[PDB]
Amino acid sequence: AGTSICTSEEWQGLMQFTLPVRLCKEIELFHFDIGPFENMWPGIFVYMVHRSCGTSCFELEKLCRFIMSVKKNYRRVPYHNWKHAVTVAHCMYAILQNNHTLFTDLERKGLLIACLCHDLDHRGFSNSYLQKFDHPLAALYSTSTMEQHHFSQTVSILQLEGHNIFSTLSSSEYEQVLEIIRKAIIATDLALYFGNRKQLEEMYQTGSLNLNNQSHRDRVIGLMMTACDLCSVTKLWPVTKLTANDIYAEFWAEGDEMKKLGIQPIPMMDRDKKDEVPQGQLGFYNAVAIPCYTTLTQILPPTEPLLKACRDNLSQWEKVIRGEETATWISS
Ligand SMILES: O=[N+]([O-])c1cccc2ncccc12
Ligand code: NI
Ligand code: NI
Numbered sequence: 001a002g003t004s005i006c007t008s009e010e011w012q013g014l015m016q017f018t019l020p021v022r023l024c025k026e027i028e029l030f031h032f033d034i035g036p037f038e039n040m041w042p043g044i045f046v047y048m049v050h051r052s053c054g055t056s057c058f059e060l061e062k063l064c065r066f067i068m069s070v071k072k073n074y075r076r077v078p079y080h081n082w083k084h085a086v087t088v089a090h091c092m093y094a095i096l097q098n099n100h101t102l103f104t105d106l107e108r109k110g111l112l113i114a115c116l117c118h119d120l121d122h123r124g125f126s127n128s129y130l131q132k133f134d135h136p137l138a139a140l141y142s143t144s145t146m147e148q149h150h151f152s153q154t155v156s157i158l159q160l161e162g163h164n165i166f167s168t169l170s171s172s173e174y175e176q177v178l179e180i181i182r183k184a185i186i187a188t189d190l191a192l193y194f195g196n197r198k199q200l201e202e203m204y205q206t207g208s209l210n211l212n213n214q215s216h217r218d219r220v221i222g223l224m225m226t227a228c229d230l231c232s233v234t235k236l237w238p239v240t241k242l243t244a245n246d247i248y249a250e251f252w253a254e255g256d257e258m259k260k261l262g263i264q265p266i267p268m269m270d271r272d273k274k275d276e277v278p279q280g281q282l283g284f285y286n287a288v289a290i291p292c293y294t295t296l297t298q299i300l301p302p303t304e305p306l307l308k309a310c311r312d313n314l315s316q317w318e319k320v321i322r323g324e325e326t327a328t329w330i331s332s
Pocket of ligand 2: 188
């Protein structure tokens with residue numbers, strides 16, 4: 001209720017943070033897992049912004065206040081949380097570094113920010129749930145319900161005193177960047193991914209894809225956002241498997257609320273149907289993740305390691321289905 005604001009101690013701490021030298025090299029790689037470095041996550045974001053956009057892209061104070069306030073407006077939910085925000089932002093960084101000059105300075109700063117912000121104030125409930133039970137948000141936002149709220153939260157944080165990192169842009173560039181962020185955030189609505197990917201595959205296979213065409217650029221950026229949102233499936237298996245535990249914790253919690261409202265949940269959301277999880281993963285990788293990274297690699301060749309990793313993880317789920325799993329550790 002209201003927008004939360006970081007403490008002076010919080011942003012000043014981030015300002016003096018220094019990244020360990022050994023991680024510099026690691027942060028460049030797609031498969032990098034932020035997991036073991038929690039105290040460093042905000043500093044990792046500063047580092048990526050500085051490397052991609054320059055140490056003078058944003059005023060350091062406004063940037064540190066922005067980052068720490070963004071953190072404070074992620075809720076303590078199992079998956080759609082601050083950890084996921086930084087993971088998605090790190091994926092975008094790796095994509096941008098590998099494709100740097102395809103994107104404008106305005107796009108890079110807008111996308112890194114869009115990724116950090118893209119699940120702001122997530123409550124651990126899906127668009128399906130909010131619309132089924134007519135939460136106030138579904139009244140306000142008829143489609144892409146959570147995504148429109150995440151954008152609105154982004155704008156609220158920028159509006160906090162001393163938090164507007166984009167103020168020094170020309171009025172034209174300011175409006176362009178807010179549009180980059182809005183489109184990028186909305187694009188993380190998976191309902192829109194299916195159409196976008198089919199369109200892109202079509203433009204690619206016929207050779208009409210043209211990055212000089214703004215509607216094409218917007219669509220390629222949308223698929224980048226999907227790729228980054230889903231990137232837990234491109235990590236090393238143990239990391240992917242552990243993250244799946246977190247995702248399913250939210251799903252099962254939503255399913256439990258549905259049962260209280262007299263409605264049996266979809267199996268994916270049913271904690272009494274865990275046997276169906278490996279097949280559900282197969283379905284998800286075949287329907288969403290594999291096609292995503294497949295098309296993204298056609299359009300941006302350097303992103304090929306995301307697709308190779310996603311394929312390796314599909315193989316691991318297939319192993320699970322056939323009863324070939326080995327010992328597994330969980331944090332419960
Ligand atoms: O939507 N996801 O982020 C996601 C990630 C990994 C596995 C999933 N399985 C089913 C639905 C969504 C999934
Ligand atoms: Ni989301
Ligand atoms: Ni997300």
